Amino acid sequence: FNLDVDSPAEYSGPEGSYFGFAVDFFVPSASSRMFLLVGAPKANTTQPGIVEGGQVLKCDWSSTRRCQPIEFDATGNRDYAKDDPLEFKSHQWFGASVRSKQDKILACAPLYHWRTEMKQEREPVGTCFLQDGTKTVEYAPCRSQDIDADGQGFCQGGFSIDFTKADRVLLGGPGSFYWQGQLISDQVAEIVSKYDPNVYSIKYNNQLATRTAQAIFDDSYLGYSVAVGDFNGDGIDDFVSGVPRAARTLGMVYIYDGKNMSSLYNFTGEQMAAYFGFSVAATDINGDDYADVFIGAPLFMDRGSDGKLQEVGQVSVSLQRASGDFQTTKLNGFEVFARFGSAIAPLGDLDQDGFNDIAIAAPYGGEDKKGIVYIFNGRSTGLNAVPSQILEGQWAARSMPPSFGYSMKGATDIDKNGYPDLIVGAFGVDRAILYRARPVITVNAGLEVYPSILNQDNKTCSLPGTALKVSCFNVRFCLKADGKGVLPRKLNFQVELLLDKLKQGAIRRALFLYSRSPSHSKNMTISRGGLMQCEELIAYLRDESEFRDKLTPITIFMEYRLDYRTAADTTGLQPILNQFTPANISRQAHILLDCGEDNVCKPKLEVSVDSDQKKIYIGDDNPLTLIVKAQNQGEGAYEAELIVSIPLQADFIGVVRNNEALARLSCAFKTENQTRQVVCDMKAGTQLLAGLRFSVHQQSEMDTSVKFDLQIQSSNLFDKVSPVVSHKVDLAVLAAVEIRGVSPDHVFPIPNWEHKENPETEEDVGPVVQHIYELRNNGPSSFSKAMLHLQWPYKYNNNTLLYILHYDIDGPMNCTSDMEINPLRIKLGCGVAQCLKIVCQVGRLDRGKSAILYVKSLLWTETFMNKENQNHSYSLKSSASFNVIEFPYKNLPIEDITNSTLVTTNVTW
Amino acid sequence: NICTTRGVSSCQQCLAVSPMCAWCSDEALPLGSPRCDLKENLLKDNCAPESIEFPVSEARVLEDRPLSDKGSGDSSQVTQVSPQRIALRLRPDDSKNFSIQVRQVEDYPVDIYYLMDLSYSMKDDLWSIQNLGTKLATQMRKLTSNLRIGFGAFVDKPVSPYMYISPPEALENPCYDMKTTCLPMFGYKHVLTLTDQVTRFNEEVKKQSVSRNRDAPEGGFDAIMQATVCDEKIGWRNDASHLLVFTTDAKTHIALDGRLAGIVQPNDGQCHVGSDNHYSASTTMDYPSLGLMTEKLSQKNINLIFAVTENVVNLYQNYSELIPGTTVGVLSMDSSNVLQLIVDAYGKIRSKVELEVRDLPEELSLSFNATCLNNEVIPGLKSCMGLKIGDTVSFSIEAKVRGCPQEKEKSFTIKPVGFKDSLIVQVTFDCDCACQAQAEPNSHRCNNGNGTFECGVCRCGPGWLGSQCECSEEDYRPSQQDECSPREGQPVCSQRGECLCGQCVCHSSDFGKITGKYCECDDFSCVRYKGEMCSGHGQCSCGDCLCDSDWTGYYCNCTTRTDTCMSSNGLLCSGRGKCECGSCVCIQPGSYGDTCEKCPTCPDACTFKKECVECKKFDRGALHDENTCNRYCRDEIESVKELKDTGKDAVNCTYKNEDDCVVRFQYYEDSSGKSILYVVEEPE
Numbered sequence A: 001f002n003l004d005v006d007s008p009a010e011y012s013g014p015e016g017s018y019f020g021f022a023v024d025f026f027v028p029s030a031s032s033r034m035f036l037l038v039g040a041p042k043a044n045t046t047q048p049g050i051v052e053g054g055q056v057l058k059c060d061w062s063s064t065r066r067c068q069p070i071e072f073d074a075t076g077n078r079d080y081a082k083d084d085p086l087e088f089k090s091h092q093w094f095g096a097s098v099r100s101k102q103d104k105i106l107a108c109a110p111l112y113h114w115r116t117e118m119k120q121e122r123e124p125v126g127t128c129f130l131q132d133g134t135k136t137v138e139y140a141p142c143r144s145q146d147i148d149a150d151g152q153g154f155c156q157g158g159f160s161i162d163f164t165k166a167d168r169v170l171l172g173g174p175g176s177f178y179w180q181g182q183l184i185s186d187q188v189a190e191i192v193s194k195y196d197p198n199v200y201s202i203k204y205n206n207q208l209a210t211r212t213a214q215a216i217f218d219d220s221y222l223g224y225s226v227a228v229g230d231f232n233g234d235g236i237d238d239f240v241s242g243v244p245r246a247a248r249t250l251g252m253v254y255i256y257d258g259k260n261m262s263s264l265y266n267f268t269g270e271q272m273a274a275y276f277g278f279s280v281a282a283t284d285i286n287g288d289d290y291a292d293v294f295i296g297a298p299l300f301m302d303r304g305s306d307g308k309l310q311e312v313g314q315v316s317v318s319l320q321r322a323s324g325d326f327q328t329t330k331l332n333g334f335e336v337f338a339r340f341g342s343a344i345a346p347l348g349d350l351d352q353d354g355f356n357d358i359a360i361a362a363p364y365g366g367e368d369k370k371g372i373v374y375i376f377n378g379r380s381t382g383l384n385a386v387p388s389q390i391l392e393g394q395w396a397a398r399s400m401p402p403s404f405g406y407s408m409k410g411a412t413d414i415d416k417n418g419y420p421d422l423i424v425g426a427f428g429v430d431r432a433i434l435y436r437a438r439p440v441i442t443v444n445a446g447l448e449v450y451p452s453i454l455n456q457d458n459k460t461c462s463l464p465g466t467a468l469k470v471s472c473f474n475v476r477f478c479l480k481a482d483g484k485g486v487l488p489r490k491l492n493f494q495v496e497l498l499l500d501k502l503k504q505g506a507i508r509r510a511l512f513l514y515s516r517s518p519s520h521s522k523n524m525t526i527s528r529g530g531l532m533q534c535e536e537l538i539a540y541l542r543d544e545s546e547f548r549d550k551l552t553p554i555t556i557f558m559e560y561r562l563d564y565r566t567a568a569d570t571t572g573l574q575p576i577l578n579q580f581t582p583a584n585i586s587r588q589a590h591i592l593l594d595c596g597e598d599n600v601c602k603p604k605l606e607v608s609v610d611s612d613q614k615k616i617y618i619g620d621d622n623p624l625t626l627i628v629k630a631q632n633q634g635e636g637a638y639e640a641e642l643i644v645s646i647p648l649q650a651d652f653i654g655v656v657r658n659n660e661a662l663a664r665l666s667c668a669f670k671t672e673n674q675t676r677q678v679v680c681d682m683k684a685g686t687q688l689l690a691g692l693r694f695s696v697h698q699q700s701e702m703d704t705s706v707k708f709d710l711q712i713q714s715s716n717l718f719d720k721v722s723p724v725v726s727h728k729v730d731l732a733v734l735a736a737v738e739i740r741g742v743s744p745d746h747v748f749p750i751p752n753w754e755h756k757e758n759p760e761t762e763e764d765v766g767p768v769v770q771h772i773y774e775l776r777n778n779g780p781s782s783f784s785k786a787m788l789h790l791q792w793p794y795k796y797n798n799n800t801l802l803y804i805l806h807y808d809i810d811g812p813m814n815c816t817s818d819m820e821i822n823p824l825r826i827k828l829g830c831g832v833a834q835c836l837k838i839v840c841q842v843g844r845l846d847r848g849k850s851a852i853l854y855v856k857s858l859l860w861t862e863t864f865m866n867k868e869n870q871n872h873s874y875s876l877k878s879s880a881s882f883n884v885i886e887f888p889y890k891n892l893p894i895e896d897i898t899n900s901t902l903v904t905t906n907v908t909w
Numbered sequence B: 001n002i003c004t005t006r007g008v009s010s011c012q013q014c015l016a017v018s019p020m021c022a023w024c025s026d027e028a029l030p031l032g033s034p035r036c037d038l039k040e041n042l043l044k045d046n047c048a049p050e051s052i053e054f055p056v057s058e059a060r061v062l063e064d065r066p067l068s069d070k071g072s073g074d075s076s077q078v079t080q081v082s083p084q085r086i087a088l089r090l091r092p093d094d095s096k097n098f099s100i101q102v103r104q105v106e107d108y109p110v111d112i113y114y115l116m117d118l119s120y121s122m123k124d125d126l127w128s129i130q131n132l133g134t135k136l137a138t139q140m141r142k143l144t145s146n147l148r149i150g151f152g153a154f155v156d157k158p159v160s161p162y163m164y165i166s167p168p169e170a171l172e173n174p175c176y177d178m179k180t181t182c183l184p185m186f187g188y189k190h191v192l193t194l195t196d197q198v199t200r201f202n203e204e205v206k207k208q209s210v211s212r213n214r215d216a217p218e219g220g221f222d223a224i225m226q227a228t229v230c231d232e233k234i235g236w237r238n239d240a241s242h243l244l245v246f247t248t249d250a251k252t253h254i255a256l257d258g259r260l261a262g263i264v265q266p267n268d269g270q271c272h273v274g275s276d277n278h279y280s281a282s283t284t285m286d287y288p289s290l291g292l293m294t295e296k297l298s299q300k301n302i303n304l305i306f307a308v309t310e311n312v313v314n315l316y317q318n319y320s321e322l323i324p325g326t327t328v329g330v331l332s333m334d335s336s337n338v339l340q341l342i343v344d345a346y347g348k349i350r351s352k353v354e355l356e357v358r359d360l361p362e363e364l365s366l367s368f369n370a371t372c373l374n375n376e377v378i379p380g381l382k383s384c385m386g387l388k389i390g391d392t393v394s395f396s397i398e399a400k401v402r403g404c405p406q407e408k409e410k411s412f413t414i415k416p417v418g419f420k421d422s423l424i425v426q427v428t429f430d431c432d433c434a435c436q437a438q439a440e441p442n443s444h445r446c447n448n449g450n451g452t453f454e455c456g457v458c459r460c461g462p463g464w465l466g467s468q469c470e471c472s473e474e475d476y477r478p479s480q481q482d483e484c485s486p487r488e489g490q491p492v493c494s495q496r497g498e499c500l501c502g503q504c505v506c507h508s509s510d511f512g513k514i515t516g517k518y519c520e521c522d523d524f525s526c527v528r529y530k531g532e533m534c535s536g537h538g539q540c541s542c543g544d545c546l547c548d549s550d551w552t553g554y555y556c557n558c559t560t561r562t563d564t565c566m567s568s569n570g571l572l573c574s575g576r577g578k579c580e581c582g583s584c585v586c587i588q589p590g591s592y593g594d595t596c597e598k599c600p601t602c603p604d605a606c607t608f609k610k611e612c613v614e615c616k617k618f619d620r621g622a623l624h625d626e627n628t629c630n631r632y633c634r635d636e637i638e639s640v641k642e643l644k645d646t647g648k649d650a651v652n653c654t655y656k657n658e659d660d661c662v663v664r665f666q667y668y669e670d671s672s673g674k675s676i677l678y679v680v681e682e683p684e
């Protein structure tokens, strides 16, 4: 919110040269000057016979801003033999990717070709140039003896690059191994030392590079964008790479180990064709010393109102926890087709609050289609989902869109003011913009009145210039200011005190003693530090004859401002006030309400609380409600306030409405000083009955009940605090578990069936009969373990009623039978017939979870043929039941739940 | 009652406070009675009926025509939506309803544009379509009578990681290395404009030739975009269905995929097909994103069909889930089954309708209640499916406003996706009364002027107050006789304002306006969902967070749309539950899931099939008389005399009917999604 939009720095390059496609800061250690490195991949050069060679330009600062190219390579195509060129530097897109660490610059030409030594061929390996102080070398790890598309021939190395803390370079080539992609990581010292201009395929000893995988991994574009950060706590930066076409184009992000190129983590997107992984950043957003991951999906389509898919883009923010897992949140875009998330730039701490901040671009959004940039601030919980600043493009389009925001680079104080600044690329109009960061000032204000309650007869002081007497008090205005970075030692503040805020043409009641107006404005100087160093003034009341409105409080109001011009510093960078510090502050006073006890009023405040929810469950959609009674049996209380305080985990939904018989209120919800409360809002002997909604769940797991506390605090001097009261609601474990199942219902001989000595197939025996059961937990609580039994007739009168075939289970349960399953290797209850018992044991199931059991059996048709011959019938039936044995809540009470169900099947000839 | 504790101050506030309030402004001034409460009250209390102001919502059809019955060549008489333009009048707090009819006209004109990938693997494919035109004509003759056929081809961008250049003579013939011949790489080329002479298609196919690609994903999205947007070049008819066939063999390129080729300019959606019919910006314009493709397909009313080989179906199917109106099919490796696929796809995208809103103001909100075939109403959703050609469906829509914005007249349209016809709604608001035309500022009718005579009580200026403005800030008389107290003991204006000469006036505020004769109401303390704020899709007055028509709820926190809640079979929540406000909740246990279709304990399907079989076989049962039994029979029914037990997953069932006979039936579904069933002609 502190980026200076009123005076950005402007840099322009040759027309049509894509000046601004790649941006970075150059901070050499050999001088006190810092440059902007701007890539112009289409800039025409003076190299012999080279058309559209590309350039990198050092744009200076604090001078006549002028960009001069760096002469990395002044030669043209080399010759392999007579009339046989080795290289093709035309349209090589040099400068498409630029990075710089310390005094080292790495620029890359992703589209560089070369003539293979094996045969006359033209392949885009891509190359890079590394400038180290005075030396300049060529780095082409993809120019090795792997020649065809199955090797590193089409590597396009240098598409994305990044330095690390340990001076090791990561380079991504999305074309290696049939466009599987590749990460090649090399030490800078080795690259510098192992350079021979006459050697075309150099061998580096300490090269870490991912190797070819199966043909399924093809067309993955591993290395589209790369980032470096630590994710296994070894102290060595690990490698973060985007693979935007992985997992059926769902896009993925690989994190490889930084010392042996082993796979550490994988992130997967949710929507196809979104280029999840188009841009990746690794920085700590919540100051836990654990690097967090930001992944962009600029083409994310999300569902809005009217169920329409809107292309807005998304950013996945993953926070790194010491357990080795990531907590992931999503941040959707704002405008349609703006491609929010195309560029993700860490900034460090933009406002030096303690938590690092980030910037995310929408290169095709804002007014017209000329791109904007959103600045997000980091908090303890992570990223704040509300941008604190919007940077807007200011350049009319041309043959191609300006693409403001297609590139950024932050975390560098180009101004040396103490606040990191930002660069935005506008290669569509061949421009680069430098946004500087202004210092943020935090200001505290203090306003109080000594008596705060005026007995109107206290005419102690005389109004100056006359002998009349008025009732008067004092008002104290105090200011404190401080900030980080380079700020002037003195700031000037304009302060206005309005002695009666709410009334407006109503006649005021309080007046300035040295004046006759309810407004007083003064200019005062504040030191950055020091003390409050504040003053006080005197105000009074007009006599009773002027007005009759005595009930209305007199509201003292304060506004403060500072002259930005005075503190604008030499460069014209004027400061800014903290975003969340309040600029206006108010106090309230009252005239005496004829209490006359001891020149003040003495209230008596009591509260009571109840509810129908005598006992509550462990966890569900809590409908918890409270009925609260508040009584003031004493004298009237000024600014009486009711407070509800709750233990660690709970939430507040709101005040019950549409209830006429129940008094309504405007209760609100606050959380401050690591304490969370509900605060709600009189005359003597006042009775009020209100209702509130709450959501409470158990997360501490040592007590079998939950508590609530109530408090009353008012502005009264003596009866400041009412006695505290507590309320209790018991916790219960209601794990409502049930069983239900079903049999085909009825079964009818088999056509073309003949008798056999022994059956070998399922059709030889007869038709199939299936029984399906399910044990399901529909209660608001979970259960640990349970058992179920299945009672099934098996044989009767030496006749096989049915023949079990096989089991099937779904869920974490293990079953067992009391008799052999499938005694013959095939490829009328239990009260009067031979029985069979199946006992199964099931583990933990939560609310809505269930375990499902499937049984398939064969019907012995010979028994039913004998039945038809003997002229009788079978009343087939079966039963099942369950009983719970354990609940996961050991400290909580345990109850026994047992039930049963019955199934049947009919057979006819 | 309401309209009395609030409003009263002026006619405009009386209109704006609530829809059912009224106002009467007779010059008689019958004081002691309210002028704002209700219409029938103003009828009595000896207030002039001709001075009673009470606008009410009114919607009347402006342009409407009967639905067409057979559109086999009518130039413009073809109609598919019966109301085409209506005028909507809304008092700026209320809502009203109107109906729409949508019909699938028989024998509608069809324009098919066949787009083909032309890689080398497509070569045999190209050989199998050499006679496609005549077969397409003879097959679509029975469906339409205005068939138009166009042809276009694509391989991939002739740019960087696709073909670049080659040091040998492969530039003019890439296939010489394989001792064959082929064309050089081409991005997209328009080949045959939509023509009604079918034989030209065949004549135009024999001269085609494939090109060598580096395998890899193709460039079909550019070809699709250019086919949609190039209106004149391709030759789309406005009053005709538009099927865009897209036949491919391998994977596809996406937007931002051309950055490897050096292309960073986004697709703009315009037409870049020159006189040579070759896509000129192929080497300069990136691939189009699915959002842009969906937008252009909706704008141009093109229905997209993905004819792909099996290898990649599970990809394109998933892609079809991000572009509504797309139909994916199976295509043989020799592409010998493409015609059947196209016939099935055309027959399947004509079977469902779907309404969309265009140019809807942010102020407005709509609620839809659909009525599908068999005269069944399924409120909450706007899309009907399962239709057949010649069928007609209806929808009811009510439109509600939070208030009225600065503009007085606006317009929008309700259009079925894929159709030409639409309904144009012109909405207007009666924000102000009729009496403002006789306003007299500072007239002597108002004491010392100082205000305005607004068809009744004077509106006092600054410093003046009270009825007739007889009191001011120079007098501030405390004698009040208007019961300036909401409750005994309670402050005169609830501490939110002050009583001056009989009436409360509310003092300053920080983050919201204050309304009411007792300063008892505001617009900032409304009840809020999750304690944040009143969600915004509705009114926030007097602590009540009212909601829109499409955002209804106690806290405005769960949409009433029923788009998620239908099951894939074509009915709501699998017929076991109801959509409450966005999630199917089912009333029977042993059921769970998004639509409660996951019920394991539910019985076999033939149990629910038995009543449908009885209905389709014999005339008995109350459900047969009520014809609600037709709802169950979603699958096609055929009468047979032989058991068609041959099938991988064919399901049989038996029924012991009331008679001694036994009913036998079978069913199964196929890959095309059409589920069929057979009933034995005579019961056993």
Ligand SMILES: CC(C)(C)c1cc(Br)cc([C@@H](CN(C(=O)CN)C(=O)c2cc(O)cc(Nc3ncc(O)cn3)c2)C(=O)O)c1
Pocket (backbone or CB within 6 Å): A149, A178, A179, A215, A216, A218, A219, B162, B163, B174, B212, B213, B214, B215, B216, B217, B251
């Ligand atoms: C002249 C030209 C340009 C026509 C040419 C020259 C030479 Br010289 C060699 C070729 C081969 C190269 N190739 C070959 O594979 C060799 N036949 C690939 O290029 C290639 C590319 C992918 O981007 C993925 C895959 N593999 C893949 N594809 C799909 C999938 O789902 C998984 N994997 C394979 C060919 O495509 O025919 C072409």
